[PDB]
């Protein structure tokens, strides 16, 4: 399998208490906010409320999206987990308020005795009907139809047939959605029917989409922060730092010498972690090439002179900014 | 066993809580306090239930976490199922697939019921609508993709209804629209309800909105509640107010009860020390937490270090907003 | 029968000669523009002349639409006539100067014997001569076949077989269009088989919809203005509100004291006619609950406590700008 | 009987009232004044008759009410119906099913005729487009419903006609595209409208707008007639000055005798007088409404009496725009 | 049969050296660009280069699309010319790309063994086969159906059976495309498969459309200005433009005195060239009516008199700004 | 004969021209200088051909005519035909049939190849994709009308194609996506290809801009590269730097050579002294003028005079400005 951004992390990593350990699962310190997520899991876990929600800000790079997928692995594949985008609402089929409504329907599961679905694919089923050849277009599903579905849905779960597996949407980007979107949470949010959510955001005083300079706090109006408890997660110490670094390193299948990983973690401390992290498959084929096995100190080094960081090439556009373009 | 309908935020409003003289009760039906505006729902829903005057329009005004929308749960519990409550989102007539008007024109049409004798069967003007739009167009109702329906399907409907009214055969169930959050509205859709109200197959429309003397979205003039004036005209207002310290206790004791969470009367004390200040929505959101966090301890009765162990995992608003402001320049 | 907010508007209430009573048909003063409202009636009746425009204008609550209805009543049944707002030109099926030529058709009618059509039935019978899920849509019907409908009019006329009925279309909240619908008016009204055409405002100076910072009188553009005669209604005295008051209350079937009409009187010209009119069926109910037949000063003051017109209501956000959204 | 033609605003307008020599009589088939505007349209009237040169453009400039429509009814009906007048206004080309280009190329092959002998068949060159389009293609020519025509259609289409002409089987009829209110069009329509009266197929374009030096649609450049000036470049100007005393007098004689009113000569001089002060068309307006007063009144002739009530009843834009900023609070 | 605006354009008139004659082809002056317009001629000719772009550049009225026909002239009707405006890419079915792609598509010829079809041809009818009866909307061709109709052909070259006839794209008006269109011609101008494109802009220094308020040279990106060649017209003299509207005169079957022709060209110097060219027509019809098969000089006076050029018609706008509209 | 392909802008690019060490030559496979960016894409190159790692960004940054595009084009000629490598303009995802992030998705989908034994097949995941949305889908393929394909196919694809590789029925085959001038997207595009990356089945994306510091379109907020800071950190800078005289004119030789055009070595110093002074690619296409017009005169080798001839008769943008700038009354 081929290895992804996130493919270390396999849960939570705490222990009967609830308290974070310091490593374990993949994840590395953030301890508040990983306790904090423990209790999420057990409101899931219950599936006594619903509609609940809960925003993960902080800067960019401090497993925001770790941490919900984090999550995921504590739930596991039972429990549906519907990822998305903020940006996935502007669809140019259907209505953004639909598109909002058709990822809360696919959150909430059904085992019907065996068979998972969710209430969207009950919905697009029953939506559906003969000359059925046409371009398969999405519609905007009418309130009435999903009343239909949870009166049936309730039937067979009274009959003993069916099972209510209330799961998860995860709205990475929420600041993506605009003012209209935002509003139309408030409904959604409040409904005794709605799943968890999970909200991640990285701005700080931005413009509102979708309004006139209406600034905000994270990029979300007061409305839709009043109706969510807030996990804030922090900046990694180098220590920390140099600890994710090694993780990924064997999640890679990668060696790296002590003082390889000492600079790295050096130049973790200035640029970001994801850069730092990013040079690790770059140093291992250059050391493959030299005829070794093992990354050397001057394998960072040189993978630091051909590669840039962010701000390291800011300043080339800024010095030699007539040259660029506009 | 878990049904598809669990404890959400109104899950414990179950009516207005009045006497047959409409007079609020202090605690009834789980609804806490607010005594002017639901003593004023009170009179609203006894006039949807004559059902005599078309098109009665109210605005329900107030500060955000005052039961503008407990309240509107309130009407609708007491109303029952039989008459109509049709509920959208301001920001839901924004549609693909049809017109601002055609969404609101539905939004109407849906919140009138037919009683029609062959056996009765019960089906909304909206739906005779769509049914005689197009062959089989009864796809359409759970579809959607309705398309814009010609005016002359309507205007043929209403005189038919009229008859069989007339006749006997059908009777008429008006019903109530609430536009939840109506200042998402523009102001093309703000000038269809002024002439769609004065309509005589129009609904009660109940509205909410939390907006101050803020911009009328679609122009650039500042308006009471982002409505314009002409419609606010045509409108009566009900003003929410902020609770009080004891109404705050009672609103918590009601949702420990409904989320069947035990606590302590200290906890209930300091809770709403904290609540009194964030805001109530941020107190009750540490019920369930705090309860979750006593259950891992093996407690039985949330403490009041349940509450401030899950104060400090969970920020409000205000608190968080302080911690971004100290790393400016980290958040983008 | 239920009753809307017009349901009292019988007619224009003038006399033979044309002058307007001062109570008659549910009207209430505004003698100056119900007769020439019963100028723009003879003008209707007589046929003769087509295209031709009236804007009736003044501030709100003047009785604008009911003064158009009032023609609407006069005409009587026979007469076709055409009710929209502006905003129903923002069709998502068909541009909107389609939506203004379908209501201009459908303002003119055809009794071909006894079958009462339209022009626009014609034109959207012959423009569809169709299911299995092929969904039927409003499409932009063009001049040629209008052409061939008019000549296959003009056919049947001549041959005794129909008769033509020129109505009226009443286009409210004219302000709600936009420069490009204002510009196709100019067309629309210079035909000879247009219609008469009854436009109401109560827009101030104030700009022109489409336009970048166009002001313009009536929020209607100079150039339309100058093809329409305008009719102005003007604001009702205390008197006058009081008769209104009382037409409204025996309309609904509500016995009102006279002490009580005299305070919804002070209130209505304290406020509003529209808030003191929507107090009488509140009233009414308070007044049946608490086992009376009649509305007494009490139950007025008592839901004039309950219920916020929009001017108290507006002290009370101002006083407290902070604590509502902004 | 009544017919579906009416008295519109231009139904007295039966020509352009010229002699052979093209020189404007003063009075004759209803049109009155504007001696230059007529000679420039019948010169323009013999090129189209003419129908050798392709493409060539016309503006027809003036203040509002000086008779610019009037002038191109005049030349539509002296053109008469054999040869096509396409007239649409500038707002008509915004479609929501087909591209603004699209609708100007759909407009200007509507304004060129195919007469094709057998039996004899006169069919334009859209019509032959949308024939060949697809194989029921002749529906789409009523309801619209065209889409975006194909390119290669065209000019297949072009060169079959070409090879009709030659054989003989086909004579081109070239006609008018009457374009009012062209200020409208944005500065896309305009780029489009460079290039496609440089085709050898194009029609003799008119167009009418009121506008002095303003923005173009869709840019922030002022322009003469809101047109930019490389369209201007390629037109030809007429100008239509105000009309005096005796001019306005005799065009509310001419309008008294289409609508089969008769005054008195001090009723004349009255309305005259408001034509002057307020505009034409106010006193146009007011000549059925002075009618209708003086037969609500049995009398047979207009008196200044009826005139001067019909303006005290109906207000032109002057007194209305003064009266309502007598009362600007009240109005929204 | 028609008389259009180019239709006395012949060719470059170039002799065999590839110097431009003075007068020769229906084209007069101009000499620099004609040559260089010649050594376009001779790259489409050579069949070697693909997507290489140029630009004509110059004030109005001084041949550009004149220079782009002429060149169409001499390649002649076998290679093929597609004649395109930049206000055409924004299309109701289709994206922008895809308009441009088709057009670039349709620039490249091929003769098959005797049929003439371009690569567009092949691309919508191997694009798709109740559908002939189903409105045929325009599609977004993807990629991978042209890179397999690319095969096809080469395969058909490779059999003798084909031969490739690459072309032109003529974009007048290029300025009206926006940013969008200009970075696609970026990657459509780089590919080894394109035509030979050519650009005409009359902008100035101007704001690219798509973008906010940056100001560029033709109203083109600086971008795509270093991937074209230019080609300057010029401003023609009074001899230049005597020349030309006597070629005019010649064309249009038009008569006209040597007076009449010395006050055509004072005429031009005075307003413009366009202008005096489309005062022939009228001046001639205008004899016609007197009488005579010659234009003199009063019909000139006469028509310039009745018809107004751009200049002196603002002056009048300008010097009636309060009564005309706005 | 004449083939499809002929000479283009990169068809000298026959790869990056590095030993095995990933050690660039100095003149090889087409390619001249741009040492540091050329190691770093060959390093780039083994990443691609490991296959282990999912979602790799790489952004080329540089100033215009730095050799950007060229790079990506022998980074793709060096991969060879078997890995996928889709390319595109950013603007190509502004799509009427699809959303921009649907565009993506596919983009995304295009890059990762499937190889399944049985004789062998090969396709992408958006065939899969289009093939089993729809009972006829595979004509989608070709002309595009997918529509918004449902997520419920794609993750069942995702799970059957896992299903594939573990039984070993199939091969992934992940390859690159080129997005040439990514600042013409929009911060949903950017937003949305954050999360795209973090996935284990996407390819590795490579991207290329010449923006310094400017504004993100979508937003007003300036940022390096167009591109926001939250995408900048997730992938790997390449700059280009600005070729020397020696560099430029080996560019020129090579060019010269792909064209088979001859020059005396005069012709070379002039046409590099004029690439230096104005721009690479105006200099690359006097090659061509030039060699046309030593073709008009009967020679066989361009000289100096051609050199001067076609820079006399063709401008760069320099000398256009400046001439357009002496006549700026002129232009509009
Ligand atoms: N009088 C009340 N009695 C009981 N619970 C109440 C009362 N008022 C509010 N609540 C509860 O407090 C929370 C407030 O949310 P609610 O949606 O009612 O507020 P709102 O006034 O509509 O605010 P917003 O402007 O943010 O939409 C909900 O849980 C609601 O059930
Ligand atoms: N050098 C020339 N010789 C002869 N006729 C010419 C010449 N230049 C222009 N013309 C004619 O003058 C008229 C205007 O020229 P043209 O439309 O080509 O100019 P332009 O403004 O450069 O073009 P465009 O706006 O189409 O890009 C046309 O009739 C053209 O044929
Ligand atoms: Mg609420
Ligand atoms: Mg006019
Ligand atoms: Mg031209
Ligand atoms: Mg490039």
Redesign the interface.
Known sequence: ???????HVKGLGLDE??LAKQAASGLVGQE?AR??CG?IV??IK???????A?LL?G???TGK?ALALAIAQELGSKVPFC?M????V????????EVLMENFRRA?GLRIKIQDVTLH?LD?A?????????????????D??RG?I?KV??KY?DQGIA??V?GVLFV??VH?LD???F??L??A??????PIVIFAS??????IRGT?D?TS??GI???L???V????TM?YTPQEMKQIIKIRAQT??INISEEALNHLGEIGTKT?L??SV??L??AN??AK??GKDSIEKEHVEE?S??????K???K???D??D???? | ???????????HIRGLGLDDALEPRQASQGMVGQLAARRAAGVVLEMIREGKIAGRAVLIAGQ??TGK?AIAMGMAQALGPDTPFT?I????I????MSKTEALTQAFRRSIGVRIKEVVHTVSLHEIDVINSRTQGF?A?????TGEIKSEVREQINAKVAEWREEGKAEIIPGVLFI??VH?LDIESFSFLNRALESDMAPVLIMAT?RGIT?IRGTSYQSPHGIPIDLLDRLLIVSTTPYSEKDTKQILRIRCEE?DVEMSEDAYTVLTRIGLET?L??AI?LI??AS??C???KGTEVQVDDIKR?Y??????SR??Q???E??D???
């Open positions: 399998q081929r290895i992804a951004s996130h493919s208490s609830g508040n306790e904090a209790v057990e409101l219950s599936k006594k409320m619903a509609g609940r809960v800000a800067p960019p790079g999206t990822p985008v903020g940006s996935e502007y669809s140019t089929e259907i209505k953004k308020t909430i694919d697009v029953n939506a559906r009907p003969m000359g059925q050849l046409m371009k398969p277009k999405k519609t905007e599903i009418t009435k139809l239909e949870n849905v309730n779960i099972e209510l209330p990475d980007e993506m003012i209209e979107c509003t139309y408030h409904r949010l409040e409904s005794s029917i709605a990285n701005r700080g005083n931005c413009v006139e209406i706090p994270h109006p007061l409305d922060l009043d109706r408890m807030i996990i804030r900046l890679e299948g970001t994801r850069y990013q040079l498959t770059p084929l250059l090439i030299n993978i002179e051909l590669f840039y960081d962010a390291s090439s800011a080339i556009l800024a030699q900014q040259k660029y373009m506009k | 066993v878990t049904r598809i309908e669990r404890i959400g935020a109104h899950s955000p976490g929308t509920a989102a301001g920001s839901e924004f549609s693909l697939e796809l109702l759970f579809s959607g993709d939840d959050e998402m939390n911009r989320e805001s929505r941020y959101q369930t937490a979750l966090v259950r891992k301890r899950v400090s995992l969970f920020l409000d608003e968080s907003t911690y971004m402001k790393y400016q980290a958040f983008l």
